[PDB]
Subunit: 198 residues, 2 copies
Amino acid sequence: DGVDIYFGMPGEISEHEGFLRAKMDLEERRMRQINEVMREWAMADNQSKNLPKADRQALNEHFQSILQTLEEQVSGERQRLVETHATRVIALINDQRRAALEGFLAALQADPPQAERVLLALRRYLRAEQKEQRHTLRHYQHVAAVDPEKAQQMRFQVHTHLQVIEERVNQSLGLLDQNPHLAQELRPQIQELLHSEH
Amino acid sequence: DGVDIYFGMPGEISEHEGFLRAKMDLEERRMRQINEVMREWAMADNQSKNLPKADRQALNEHFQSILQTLEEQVSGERQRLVETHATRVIALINDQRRAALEGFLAALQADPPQAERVLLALRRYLRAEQKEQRHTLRHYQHVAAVDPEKAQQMRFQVHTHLQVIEERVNQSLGLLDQNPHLAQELRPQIQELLH
């Protein structure tokens, strides 16, 4: 129990499928609980006509309240599932960007620098940044699609994050410019990369 | 093009895969649009770093206005996609229930009525009602999960719809008990199924 949670999900399971799986398990679990409550409600409701006013009242009050509690648990649970998943998606994206930066740096500091190795290490870093950019855009797009007031409030933050990504890209291309010969030789390929990743 | 719209989605593509595909296409489309505006805003920033304060402001309002409009389009669009899809899912559930009911009745009213046929038709019908029940429960579960405020207004409707479904199942089994012999024959298998 406390042990299985330590080991977590087996490696053969991606965060994405693990997330969907968890989401479906909870969907099914809650559907059964709702059904059980609705069934109990129907049973009791069938006897309502032969009850005194006060008992009739305490009876509807009873089920409305149980459903209130269940609605709160379903909602609180989804919120927890969504946060856990969003946090992990973001961390992976950040981890991959950092790993790719390290690799690009090593290629640059090699004695001597191999154009093809530098271009590929850079490509990987740019793709890590494209992934982060798409993540930012998709998140905003999702909020706008389902919640307008929140979209408006995050507008500037999206713009800012996109400028941070743009600056990391320029900073990386600046690292490549400390080796003129190399930069000139790779400019045409890098331009193609920057265009397609847009 | 009005022609392609007429032909619509190939019959082989389910309403589910068609929906997800449309949703993804719109996701990608809006993401590109949003990125285009963000780039212009970023660019307009740099090509204005040496201008007046009030002009840098007027430029901010301008892009925020453009985004306010895009957010509204993205929202109305999702609203339409969702409405269309929900409407088709419900209609298909009703069409399937009715088709299964007709098959059950055809098997029952056959001459003579064959046990094994009536039994398979009954299962298909019960499964159709099971699908409708799950749809009702899932819709409620979903609204509670992502929009608990509006869940409270659904309580009575779900309660009612669930009883409608149960009552329909009981009426249909009643079509069976209307033929004493056949009812006796299938009596034990009918029992196992209920669970």
